[PDB]
Design a protein around this ligand. Structure first.
Ligand SMILES: [Fe+3]
Length: 51
């Protein structure tokens, strides 16, 4: 699945993950640590919406 950051437009793709910030490819959005934030704008997970 893909989620968009409502603040800046960054797309979190579960297939790509966010390796530079400790999230390997395949990690579901729900499993990402609660302290992880948008790598572009710093928005918390609450500001993402599932596409
Ligand atoms: Fe963002």
């Amino acid at each position: 699945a893909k989620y968009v950051c409502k603040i800046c437009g960054y797309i979190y793709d579960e297939d790509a993950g966010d390796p530079d910030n400790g999230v390997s490819p395949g990690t579901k959005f729900e499993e990402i640590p609660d302290d992880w934030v948008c790598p572009i704008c710093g928005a918390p997970k609450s500001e993402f919406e599932k596409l």
